A paper describes a structure:
Previous studies suggest mitochondrial ABCB7-type exporters are involved in maturation of cytosolic iron-sulfur proteins. Here, we report a series of cryo-electron microscopy structures of a eukaryotic homolog of human ABCB7, CtAtm1, determined at average resolutions ranging from 2.8 to 3.2 Å, complemented by functional characterization and molecular docking in silico. We propose that CtAtm1 accepts delivery from glutathione-complexed iron-sulfur clusters. As anticipated, the architecture of CtAtm1 harbors the classical ABC-fold, packing into a homodimer with six transmembrane segments (TM1–TM6) in each monomer.
Next, we determined a single particle cryo-EM structure at an average resolution of 3.0 Å, CtAtm1inw-opn, exploiting wild-type protein without supplementation of cargo but in the presence of ATP. The computed maps display well-resolved TM-domains, while the resolution of the NBDs is somewhat lower, and hence we are unable to confirm the absence of nucleotide binding. Nevertheless, de novo building of almost the entire structure was possible (580 modeled amino acids), with the exception of the first 94 residues in the N-terminus that includes the signal sequence for mitochondrial localization, and the last 26 residues of the C-terminus, likely related to flexibility of both termini. Thus, the configuration is distinct from the available structure of eukaryotic ScAtm1 and hABCB7 (PDB-ID 4MYC27, 7PSL28 and 7VGF26, RMSD 4.2, 3.8, and 3.2 Å), in which the NBDs interact via C-terminal extended helices in the S. cerevisiae structures. As such, our structure is more open, exposing a large cavity (>7000 Å3 as calculated using the software CastP3.0 with a 2.5 Å radius probe) that spans more than half of the membrane into the TM-domain. The cleft is decorated throughout with electropositive amino acids and is partially blocked at several levels: (1) at the matrix-membrane interface through the Asn395 pair of TM6 (one per monomer, conserved among eukaryotic Atm1), establishing an “inner” gate (the first from the mitochondrial matrix), and additional residue pairs closer toward the mitochondrial intermembrane space that firmly links the TM6 pairs. Notably, these amino acids also divide the cavity from Asn395 into two separate, symmetrically related, parts. We propose the inward-open configuration represents the resting state of eukaryotic Atm1 proteins, in which the protein exposes a highly electropositive cleft to the inside of the mitochondrial matrix, as detected in the CtAtm1inw-opn (and E603QCtAtm1inw-opn) structure.
Residue numbers in the entry:
A (entry chain A), B (entry chain B): 95 to 674
The structure:
Amino acid sequence: AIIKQMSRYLWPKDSWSDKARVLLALSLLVGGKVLNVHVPFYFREIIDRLNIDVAAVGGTVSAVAGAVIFAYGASRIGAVVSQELRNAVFSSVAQKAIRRVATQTFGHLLNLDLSFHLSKQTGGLTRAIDRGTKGISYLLTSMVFHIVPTALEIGMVCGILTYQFGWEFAAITAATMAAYTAFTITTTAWRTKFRRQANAADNAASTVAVDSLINYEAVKYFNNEAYEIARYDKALQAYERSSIKVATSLAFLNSGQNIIFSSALTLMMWLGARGVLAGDLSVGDLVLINQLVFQLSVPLNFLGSVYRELRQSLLDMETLFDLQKVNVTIREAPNAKPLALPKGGEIRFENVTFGYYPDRPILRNLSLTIPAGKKVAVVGPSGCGKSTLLRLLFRSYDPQQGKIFIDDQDIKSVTLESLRKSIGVVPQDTPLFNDTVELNIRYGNVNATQEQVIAAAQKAHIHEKIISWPHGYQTRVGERGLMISGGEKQRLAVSRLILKDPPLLFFDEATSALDTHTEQALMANINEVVKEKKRTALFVAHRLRTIYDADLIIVLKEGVVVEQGSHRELMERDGVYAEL
Amino acid sequence: AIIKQMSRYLWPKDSWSDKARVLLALSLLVGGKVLNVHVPFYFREIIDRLNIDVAAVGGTVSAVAGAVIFAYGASRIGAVVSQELRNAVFSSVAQKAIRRVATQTFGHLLNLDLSFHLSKQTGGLTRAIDRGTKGISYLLTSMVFHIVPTALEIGMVCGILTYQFGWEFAAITAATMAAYTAFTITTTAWRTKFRRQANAADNAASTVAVDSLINYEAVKYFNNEAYEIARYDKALQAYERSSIKVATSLAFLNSGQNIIFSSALTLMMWLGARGVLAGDLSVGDLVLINQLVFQLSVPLNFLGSVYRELRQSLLDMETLFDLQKVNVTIREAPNAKPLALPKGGEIRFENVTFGYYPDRPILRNLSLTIPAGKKVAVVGPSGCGKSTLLRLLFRSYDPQQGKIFIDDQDIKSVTLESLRKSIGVVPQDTPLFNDTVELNIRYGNVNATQEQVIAAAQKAHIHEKIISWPHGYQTRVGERGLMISGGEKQRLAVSRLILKDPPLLFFDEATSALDTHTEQALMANINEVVKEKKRTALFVAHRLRTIYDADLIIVLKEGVVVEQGSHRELMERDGVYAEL
């Protein structure tokens, strides 16, 4: 369709060295097929040069026919070396084009907003990348390795047999190619029934075996071992009756292909023999005809798998380039200015309503104000949407109506990357990369040096903990690494937040693990990293007891701002710490 | 080794029709190779019959060379049809021999005692069966499909070229075959490094992709999308530098193979050309030499996979026939008599000590007596070994010292199948086959009819429950079926016990699900199936409250029989129902 020219006319043609390698691959393709059709010409030159009066004019080899013997051998060697060099060169080209496609699509996927990554089963995007790149691999691979060389050689053989022997040799060669391809495609589409039935019956017999070996006690308690042997034997009989059809249909495929092609070679033998006894041809031309058509029979092993797998690969290519056409719903404003970093960072909310699936809102005409340079908390019941303040103010979601101000300009008018540089985040469930502790601390600022990571782990009080690990700060940590508690994960996220050093800071349920003393220590250490450096910290916790010492408290009751105050005057609401 | 003659000389030679099919396969093998070497003989007969004075003695085709043209075509067709018919016939033979091997080994595995099935990771025996049968399949398949036809054709080609042209053509053909096989084996063993490295680098790049798409929020919070694109690009570059080595080494393999074989064909061309100008040969004999050696080049695609995979298949065959040499530790006594079924069934224990891993015993010099025709329970703390009374009295384990009597003869002297027919079992965790409810009830006596299953489900009061299921008593039940509570599983086991109808009955923790009313109903229904039919029932429960109404109670305190009695006089021990 249009997908083939979407791939082939953009990625294999981008620079000079890649275009030079594509031209090298095409020149090796045509040179290989030229040498391949020169092999039978030199073999008939051997035959017709040695078909002389031996006792009269035949002197010696390397004066009668040595040049064409060496040319037959060299053309044979060069015709396969050019195929293999063409395959190596175009595998290089296809792998580079696939790398550029996958890199661009992955960069686009990371550039899409959060709602796409929540509306997709994770790990399925990687499956789409992998199947799409294998689809591009298979379509370029079986178009340059198999289909184009075969069609070029069919064209050259029909042209040669037309030019030297007549149109009917090309007619029989083209009809042979058509009938061989039609037979192979049709009966290979027929054989997949038998292959899938044999796989299903094999799995059925193996499941009878494992279902009778799981239940071994129940087999022995009721004396049904002979019955289960009979069940296994019946399942294996039904397996072998399908493997019979697999091997029988493979026999039919192979013998039908060679019956077609041997009928071709015998008919062309008869027509060449008619030509030789008419004086037109010679006995070398018989072997020219036979070897040209037979050399067409050699590379046609691809034709079994091709017709299903280019369809599958075009589907996978369609999914990959459909991923590349997803647009982002959050638009950076044109001529957006990075601004208000040197200003005293205040965050102002005006009449914003937000909701996932906007028929039900989560925030209901909310308006708050974070004063500049101060530490402010917002609290509420577990489920009131205070976790949906990050995503609206980090601008991974957009407010449906309303405006957000950071030092008196809109966050929909600042450059998005500057806004995300200004905000610092300690999330709820801190995710750990399957990599070292050193990378999971250096992720706050990847250009920072080693002793900066040392000082940042020192500031969060985890240096003794990572020296206490066996490999030191090189420890394999994460899902497939050394498993740790959630408190150390939170403190790792804190150390990342020192390494970013942003102006504005969020701590959205930063203290939400199990043990209360751990979150008291966490609140303590984030309190010394908040103070004395003008970090306009914002806090979210469902436990107002843990954020009791804040400079300013705002409450959120069902999407509205209700009251503001201090510890004791706002401790009066429910959810008290009396049951703790 | 000895494994090859252990397989090939027993299972392919068992009956007349199988031996007739093996002889048919061997005759098709030799006939196919005879026709294959007659193809170039007829082609040189075409060449030498048309190499006449055309204007003088050449009359017409089908009087000069028509017979050998048709014989060339027919020999070509027959030489591939005989290969395909040989492959179909021997695939039939190999599948039947594999079915007999797997059936015998599965019957042996069910005939092994319980300790083997506990000392084996379940589902690994099925893996041993499957890998061993695929090993037998691959060794017979690549010995009759590939290796024996190739070695036979090499022998026939070297014999023909010796008989007609001289010993040096056979020397060059054998050296060609040796060098081609050595090169293909060596460089295919070399290429697996590159294939495995490319697979590892592909998996590394895909895991970088999924590890950066799992953590998408953390990527966006710290502005490291360009860093993760760079990480993905580095991983894909390290993948393509290994796929370069895969395709380059494949190019080296294919071009080296054809350089070897084209050097052979050119050298034999030179020697035949030397022969033609000496008067010995003719110009058809050139094509005889060329086509014989080239037809040796055709079927050698097997040689890549063969050397590793026969080693793997011999290992799998070794595991399968090692499974078949496991002996049973419980020996049926010679001249054992089935006896004491018509006697009033009493079970007598005398001074038996048992222990799993016999350095620690579980039963400590125990001796009890079950009176004939009565309902007797044994109880103790959870872990005292009352669950190890079944396995000692069903004789799935043997007592280390002591003797067991069923109506005054040893259970080590009765025929084992008669003993297991006499005992009836309701186990602790009743296992359900992944099949119908009707099979899971008919498993008590597989020869019983439908309305017997109806009456047995009626006797256990589950008929309303199975009619209440959607498919009726044909319901798919088990692990992959309609999941049910453990009480219905226990009541299913009860219905199996009606369908067996044994003389002696066990109910080892038959009532051990969650809900107490369910086990009270279970105890009630098994009490009506115990009474009024002289079933010498034995009971095990950790809850003595649920077996409080027994005719006789024996207690077990740490492997000894301590006291016997009734409900209130033995209710005095701990674990009372006061906390229930």
